[PDB]
Amino acid sequence: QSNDYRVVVFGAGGVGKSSLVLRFVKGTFRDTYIPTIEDTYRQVISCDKSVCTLQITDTTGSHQFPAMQRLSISKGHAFILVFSVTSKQSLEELGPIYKLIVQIKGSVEDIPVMLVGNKCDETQREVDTREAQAVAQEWKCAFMETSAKMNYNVKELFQELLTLETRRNMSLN
């Protein structure tokens, strides 16, 4: 019997969802020319004095058919909501999915939800760190800034996400 812990990665096109997931799971880059289609990646992790598979779903963002978004949330245990610090529009585009997550799971307080400001290697920002912190405070969720490019806070994101789950004791080690 498999005991998968399922993480779904949401966000607008171009924010770095695929780059975050590939940096974490494979230590590699997103090849621009590979076809844009949902994939799920597997990583073995420690869970409850044993092992389980972390399943990470790299969604296609605004291309994802809404019924498929619903199914992804229903199947998911934890959520990573990625925006680019260079795009205020990308942060705004998380509104609908956050709402649907909270509605389907009943409350933000009952599952791990992480707001992620990716591309924090960039100097021309549209969303300040303090602004993103306020969003997360108002949404009652966690927040982290990352650079997939620089491998900055990439392992830390998944570790913190796993630590937020109170029903299992999970670790990357």
Ligand X SMILES: Nc1nc2c(ncn2[C@@H]2O[C@H](COP(=O)(O)OP(=O)(O)O)[C@@H](O)[C@H]2O)c(=O)[nH]1
The Cα 93–Cα 109 span in angstroms is 21
Any contact of residue 122 with ligand X (CB under 6 A)? Answer: yes
Contact region with ligand X (CB under 6 A), list: 10-18, 99-107, 132-140, 156-164:
10-18
What are the tokens at 153?
A: 């806070």
Any contact of residue 11 with ligand X (CB under 6 A)? Answer: yes
Query: How many chain residues interact with ligand X (CB under 6 A)?
Result: 17
What mask, x for binding ligand X by CB under 6 A, covers residues 13 to 52?
xxxxxxx----------x----------------------
Q: Is 61 annotated as a binding residue?
A: yes
32 Cβ contact list (under 8 Å, min separation 6) = none
- Choose which of 48, 109, 110, 121 interacts with ligand X (CB under 6 A): 121
Contact region with ligand X (CB under 6 A), list: 40-48, 95-103, 128-136, 143-151:
143-151
Stretch (H or E) spanning 158: helix 154-164
Amino acid at 164: L
The Cα 30–Cα 46 span in angstroms is 27
Using an 8 Å Cβ cutoff, are 50 and 1 in contact? no
What are the tokens at 134?
A: 């306020």
**Which stretches of the chain bind Mg ion, using CB under 5 A?**
18
Residue ranges of the annotated binding site for GTP are: 14-19, 30-36, 58-62, 118-122, 148-149
